[PDB]
Amino acid sequence: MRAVIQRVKKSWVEVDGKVVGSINEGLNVFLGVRKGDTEEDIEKLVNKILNLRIFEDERGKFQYSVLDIKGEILVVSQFTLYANVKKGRRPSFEEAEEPKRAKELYEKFVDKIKESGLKVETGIFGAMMDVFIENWGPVTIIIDSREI
Amino acid sequence: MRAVIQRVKKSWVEVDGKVVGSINEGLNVFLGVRKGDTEEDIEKLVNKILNLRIFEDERGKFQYSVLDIKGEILVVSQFTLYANVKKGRRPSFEEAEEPKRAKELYEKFVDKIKESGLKVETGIFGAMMDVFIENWGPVTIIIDSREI
């Protein structure tokens, strides 16, 4: 499983102009499910995201996690995180989990993270969205579950 | 060298409220320089980004590159792409190139890519920015030069 998390000040998803999830100061999380992915991948991941000290105050950078600052979280499906650009001009997605299983793992992932007790919005799965991100810093981190 | 590229419809960087780079339909590129990085890493990278068929029309997805659609490019420095979250709650950046060399490789990278002939904006290097991204799709791709 993989994730691109961007520290945001404001961030939301809208479909056809209708916003379907919004957050203020917090984290935007791009989620990509991998063939192979399991419940443990969700764990090993949902964890590092919640305790990542990427937030700062005026005294030091990288000292507070999303929980610490009690921030908001926005999860957005992104099967393209397992893109293979090794050959053609066109990217491959052999490692990307099939949509059905993927939605599954996706919903479980979002459920696990709501356990943080934080406000967690989401995007829509299976269709196109216009994701609005205001990356403060900017701060972007990549994390794979097969690596944690 | 590493990059997180997000297909955008609109995207800009602003410092203290003063926009310092803007683009309309095109690509937002997050750049992270690695200790080790060389001129060839810039090549092996600047290339895959320019020919990536991630743009679509109404007849098929993933068929046009930034050049193909003659899109705009926005490069934003992001040393955090080489973040190590393997141990503590706090991320490590051992692999991130030192700032001085990094700015260097950064400027060369942006120069190489301007050779595409496309409109290429940039952010400011060395200080904080508020990066505005409107990811259409959304479409996000990760690419390392040590992998291409």
Curated annotation (Swiss-Prot), chains A, B:
Q: Does the keyword tRNA-binding apply?
A: yes
Q: Which branch of life, at top level?
A: Bacteria
A Gene Ontology biological process annotation?
tRNA metabolic process
The UniProt entry's coiled-coil ranges are: none
| SUPFAM superfamilies for the chain | DTD-like (SSF69500)
GO-annotated cellular components: cytoplasm
Q: Motif Gly-cisPro motif, important for rejection of L-amino acids: residue span?
A: 137-138
Primary localization: cytoplasm
The function of this protein is: An aminoacyl-tRNA editing enzyme that deacylates mischarged D-aminoacyl-tRNAs. Also deacylates mischarged glycyl-tRNA(Ala), protecting cells against glycine mischarging by AlaRS. Acts via tRNA-based rather than protein-based catalysis; rejects L-amino acids rather than detecting D-amino acids in the active site. By recycling D-aminoacyl-tRNA to D-amino acids and free tRNA molecules, this enzyme counteracts the toxicity associated with the formation of D-aminoacyl-tRNA entities in vivo and helps enforce protein L-homochirality.
What is its quaternary makeup? Homodimer.
**What is the designated name of this protein?**
D-aminoacyl-tRNA deacylase
Organism name: Aquifex aeolicus (strain VF5)
Instruction: Tell me the lineage of the source organism.
Output: Bacteria, Pseudomonadati, Aquificota, Aquificia, Aquificales
